[PDB]
Write a protein that binds this ligand. Sequence first.
Ligand SMILES: Nc1ncnc2c1ncn2[C@@H]1O[C@H](COP(=O)(O)OP(=O)(O)OP(=O)(O)O)[C@@H](O)[C@H]1O
Ligand SMILES: Nc1ncnc2c1ncn2[C@@H]1O[C@H](COP(=O)(O)OP(=O)(O)OP(=O)(O)O)[C@@H](O)[C@H]1O
Ligand SMILES: [Mg+2]
Ligand SMILES: [Mg+2]
Lengths: 634, 634
Amino acid sequence: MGPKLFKPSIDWSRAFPDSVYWVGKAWTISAICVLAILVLLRYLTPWGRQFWRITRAYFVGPNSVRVWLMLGVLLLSVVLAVRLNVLFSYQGNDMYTALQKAFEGIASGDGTVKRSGVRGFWMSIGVFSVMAVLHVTRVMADIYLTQRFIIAWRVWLTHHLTQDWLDGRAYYRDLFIDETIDNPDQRIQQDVDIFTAGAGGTPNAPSNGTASTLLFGAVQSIISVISFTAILWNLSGTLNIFGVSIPRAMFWTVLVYVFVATVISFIIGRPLIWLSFRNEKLNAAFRYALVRLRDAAEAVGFYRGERVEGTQLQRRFTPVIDNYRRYVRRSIAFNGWNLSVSQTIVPLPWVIQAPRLFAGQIDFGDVGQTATSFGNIHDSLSFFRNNYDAFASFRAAIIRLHGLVDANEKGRALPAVLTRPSDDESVELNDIEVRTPAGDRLIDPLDVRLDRGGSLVITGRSGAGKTTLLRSLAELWPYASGTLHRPGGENETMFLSQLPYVPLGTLRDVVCYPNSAAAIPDATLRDTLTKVALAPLCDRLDEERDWAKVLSPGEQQRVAFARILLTKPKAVFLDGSTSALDTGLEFALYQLLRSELPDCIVISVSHRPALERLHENQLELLGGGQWRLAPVEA
Amino acid sequence: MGPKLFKPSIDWSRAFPDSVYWVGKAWTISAICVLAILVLLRYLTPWGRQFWRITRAYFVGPNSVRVWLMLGVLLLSVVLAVRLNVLFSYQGNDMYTALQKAFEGIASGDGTVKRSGVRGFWMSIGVFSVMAVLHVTRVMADIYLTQRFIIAWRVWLTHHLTQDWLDGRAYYRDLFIDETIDNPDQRIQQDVDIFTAGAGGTPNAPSNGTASTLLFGAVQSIISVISFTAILWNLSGTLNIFGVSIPRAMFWTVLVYVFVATVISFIIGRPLIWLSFRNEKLNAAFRYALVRLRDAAEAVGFYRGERVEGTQLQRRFTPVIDNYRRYVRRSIAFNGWNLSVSQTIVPLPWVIQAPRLFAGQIDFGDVGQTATSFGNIHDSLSFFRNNYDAFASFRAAIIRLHGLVDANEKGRALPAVLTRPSDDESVELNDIEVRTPAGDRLIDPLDVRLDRGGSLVITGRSGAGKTTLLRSLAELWPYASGTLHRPGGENETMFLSQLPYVPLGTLRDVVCYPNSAAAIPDATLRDTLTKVALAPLCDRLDEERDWAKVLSPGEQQRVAFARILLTKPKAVFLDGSTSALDTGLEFALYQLLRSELPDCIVISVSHRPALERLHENQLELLGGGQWRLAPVEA
Ligand SMILES: Nc1ncnc2c1ncn2[C@@H]1O[C@H](COP(=O)(O)OP(=O)(O)OP(=O)(O)O)[C@@H](O)[C@H]1O
Ligand SMILES: Nc1ncnc2c1ncn2[C@@H]1O[C@H](COP(=O)(O)OP(=O)(O)OP(=O)(O)O)[C@@H](O)[C@H]1O
Ligand SMILES: [Mg+2]
Ligand SMILES: [Mg+2]
């Protein structure tokens, strides 16, 4: 309380050479405990145990020597933010220190403290011109850095998940597992963005800095409590209320005040998670019902069915807007509580340090410098309930993804049929039985053996087990028993489907489907198209329009016979394959196939009685188990 | 500058009875010009001319007497926010007025102004206890109101758009228009939320108040400039810089300072729109390539095609992350400019009103009350460039939707075939010619006439014009010419498709497809299923699993013959319909159809030569135009 002209808090020279040493002391002692508190979170927390299984291999191994070095700069770019906020309070003390001398020198009649109290006011603006360029050049050097880390996380994670999805035929076997999951188109396109952005339940947009990320919004709000506690601890008073006498009231009041409002802020947003998990599923079972309609547009027009289908969208839409009107009724009562507790504390330090100012105990700088600090350590400890709803939707993005990796791990543990390679050319099978998930019986244990040159046709009933035998002989059906010896290899067992399939790309990839695009010489790609009477498609081989609804269904089978000859297998199975072709061109194709390929074991399924002149054995399924194998004659 | 104890600015009694009259004066004079400035925006602005065509009928007509009454309360709940912010400055003047008397009474030796200067300090907290409950009970009474307006906008708009999509067979004819649009599954599920939320390019989440909406963030930032200009205008000084002498410098400096930084903030974010339109299309042509894979899972397994399809996702993914690394390079240089101009103005009023305080011109209240006002009218005029990027993505949500309503209006202006109702039972056609969009010729102008009891089969070549004639006779194909007389009605011309189709719902809707669910008596729904040998599906009629991949393709045709008999038409066309059934059950079905329905004009397309014993006429297409019509014998 001395009548000296002006006393600055710090010397302001040897201030920058001293504020570099504190950063170097507070970097390492933060990092070597942050790694400990993360490693302690991986083991003993059930929302974080499922985190490491999702994104394991990106952090260990040899390639992760660059990710940690990118991560280690962002801790520096947070300590450098706390160190500026300390000096923004140490500057703001001096204005309210100098403006008391500059006032009372006028009323006291002094002429040497008014002249020497205003020299401090033209000093404290001199700090606010260099501590305000470093604040602007930091934030613009922070948006660019944290926008080049999550890109290299997303572009690796959405490649790691797809290769595990379609690795082991797990894109088909997931429909037979017990606790089935739904619409995996959303867990790759959409819910990898929210999981790797870390912000909320919202995808990232190019303005998210470090201060809006759930991991780095916490370490910034823990360092900024340890650093701002050495100032208030030697500033509070001994408030003697009735009863007991508190030694330091201001520092110990906020610590019990935050704790009561923290526990109440956790038992309100408790079912807030499962109301934000259903909203991402009900708005994904709605967008499937339109994509099923769009590329089925031809068959709905012939039926005039625009009044039944109009009921289904209203039946699948109305539980979305009904599961939103009880989700907005929860996130008002929770958000109305964390506003009514962050307002009724703001005129607190102005009344506990009020009578110590009208008496000469302090000198008007400490009131403002106390208000700035109490409005900082209370807000930075208020991070752990004011950002709870933006953690809830994030925790519904970890369960949603973890239900995919642990659904194609249980997708390959179902039984199948064992295959072994033959020695030269033979298709034999010892015993094969197949069933139905209801628990029926289709085929009894049967036996057959075929050699290099041979043929076989399978006829039977209308819908009693004729494709299921083909679905079980390629390791694609779960309920079966037996073995198989095949002429194995890479592409030596070519199947075809009862319904035709085309790919998505250009016309150069529609004809060479199992092979790649450039592995076929273009000089004789067009020549084999003339052998199957597709002359007017020899041109326009480099178009780009979709071929799903352009070609006829009778034109998608003659292109498959071009797919057979461009791979040259030895164990071709094919069913249907002439559902639209007339008689007169079919056996011409078969006499072409026999004369271009001498020895391929043709195994077919047909209904019209005009193919038995081309096969030497015949298997008939009477349905229910009784089968008969016989050679044909005349 | 009087030495009186304390002078409050307003009387603080008859303050609430006077602050109600100003709200009533500032409500109507705001509304009757806001309607004018909106009506002037509808006509003469090309981003707003397309706005009224999207959402026209929700604002005119008889039902819109409730929407305007819901809208008129939110203007009151914004004027009530500006009127509190005026008094938050009129309160904050009094602290810095009283704390000068309370200081200089200590140094001057006075004992009757120190005692009577501190009584003002225990008055200005008495205002901060009632003007802080009304701030909390307003915001929590504002989140609830604006969350029940956009729900009743979304739940009407996403119903208005779908009924216009599939009204006039415009879900199929859009593939023949000139400037084709893509993936209309996204313009209904996703891009109705951003258009009706009004916030940014982000969907709404249940914490958006009035202060985060592009319409009501502007009227709140125009009233709050007219109201805060009567205070600074009688407070600035006459700053005599070298050269000319400005009469009122502080008020006229900010007005030319915002204008220079506003024009520069518009020529930086100029191509920011078309970089935020491509991001919503490239992340919607990626989510189609997985939904095409998921329900095509059977045919890919037989082909082992997991290496070509793995190239296509990487070919369709990499221009998404490449159209993001030049979008983050634009929204840093723009966002680095509107931060470097909202920082270099903040120590301005502390240095223009500095020497008027160390001399006794003003009395330390006006410095703070000037700083609070200059940090308010500068920020509220800074709304029109600090919220420009969140307008750009919104303007890419109006073009994206307007390309849908103006794409099924041009989707029904294509030519077709004219139909007229017959008198009793007759299918005649005068002349019909059909073509191909390349400009080929399929069928010459032909003629045929059929009566009550009759039949016809159409055979021909492999893929030369046999379904296109059926696609043009139901007003579904654009390139055709001619007329038709039909036995019309509601459901008296039933077609079938060459590929079978099932609906999505339960098993009660898979068999009664053009009719509704409850319009069929359940006592005889099961009895007609026994006539087509579907006995073991008579049970389990109320299941819920999807029937796309459960039934066989040979089982989806015998259920269609149950769809025919449950509607009883007179002019049934059917093609294929026996692609999987063996001989022996087919003519049993036809002799069932002839014996349950006596007179229906059966018109079929078939390839196997076993149906000509059931028809009396026959049309043969030789391909290229030459056709022949003849009766069959033996
Ligand atoms: N974009 C297109 N949309 C529809 N048809 C096309 C298109 N481009 C070409 N076409 C022609 O349409 C014909 C399809 O014929 P249609 O629709 O009658 O099937 P189809 O010949 O009856 O098949 P099938 O005879 O095997 O049952 C093809 O021959 C093809 O030349
Ligand atoms: N969820 C299911 N998945 C697969 N098959 C099922 C399922 N439920 C029942 N099935 C049985 O599978 C049989 C389908 O037979 P398959 O797959 O061999 O077709 P298909 O009988 O060859 O058809 P078609 O003989 O007309 O070509 C049906 O008879 C049905 O009883
Ligand atoms: Mg089958
Ligand atoms: Mg056809």
